[PDB]
Amino acid sequence: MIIPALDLIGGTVVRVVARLRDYGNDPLPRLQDYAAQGAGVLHLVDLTGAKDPAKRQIPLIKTLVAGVNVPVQVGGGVRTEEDVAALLKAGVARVVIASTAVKSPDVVKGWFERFGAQALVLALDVRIDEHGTKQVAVSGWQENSGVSLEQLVETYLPVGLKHVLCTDISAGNVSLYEEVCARYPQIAFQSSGGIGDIDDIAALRGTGVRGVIVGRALLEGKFTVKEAIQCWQN
Incomplete structure (x- = not known):
């Protein structure tokens, strides 16, 4: 399967190039449209949590998981058993x-x-x-x-x-x-x-x-999740 991915820092969708470009503060509609096109799994990297686990974006992650109908795997600053448990409790399907x-x-x-x-x-x-x-x-x-x-x-x-x-x-x-x-x-x-x-x-x-896993190419509009899946399945 294709696994669409977003990197998040302080609520902002960013592209990693280490250079960072702002792709807006709308991660939920983005993720919802990925799922709408057939994605069976999504991938999130919590860059804020990776820098400081104390600032793990749990409230945002909760919202995002709640807002889609497919499992999300989430990484970023997973250092302890408590980190894993917190993400799972927030509704994450898999911890990276x-x-x-x-x-x-x-x-x-x-x-x-x-x-x-x-x-x-x-x-x-x-x-x-x-x-x-x-x-x-x-x-x-x-x-x-x-x-x-x-x-x-x-x-x-x-x-x-x-x-x-x-x-x-x-x-x-x-x-x-x-x-x-x-x-x-x-x-x-x-x-x-x-x-x-x-x-x-x-x-x-x-x-x-x-x-x-596909991240930047979707943000840059090279192809859509639907096109990615069609190519992957053929």
Whole structure:
């Protein structure tokens, strides 16, 4: 499926380029129109909460989830068990765990045990290094942490990992997704980044990728969610 995405900071829809462009304070109508076009899942990044978990945009997130009829996965500053629980209580379908999944795997394994694998998405940034290894990093501006995508996935398979979001931070690579999806067919991989036009979606068909996250291309009016879904399903 196509997974339309918004980044939110203080109620504002923004485009990440780190440069930020204002696309207005209307996230709910935007999300509603994404769902209206057939989206089965939506993705939100709470950039305010990522900067300071104390300022997690829970009231806004509550409104947004209430305002659509499809599950929303939400990330941004998910550091503690309490963070996960707060988002779920707000009505979020899945909590996106990013840096903490790299930093404290034994702790996050406990979260799988408490919340269940259907409630959690592990978001991993990947750099392909000179050797061709898929190196995990916690962000685009930090060095690699010294664990491969495969090694980290295999860390969480024993607690029933089901959802992994993989962003290539090294138009959009296809080989990356083909490889990992084939190796772990019991995991539903999502791809993020590199979607600049409709042909980029077509390119990911047949790779085995389950979900294609699309953010900026929808904001920039390159194509619609309906067109993305039509291309994805054909």
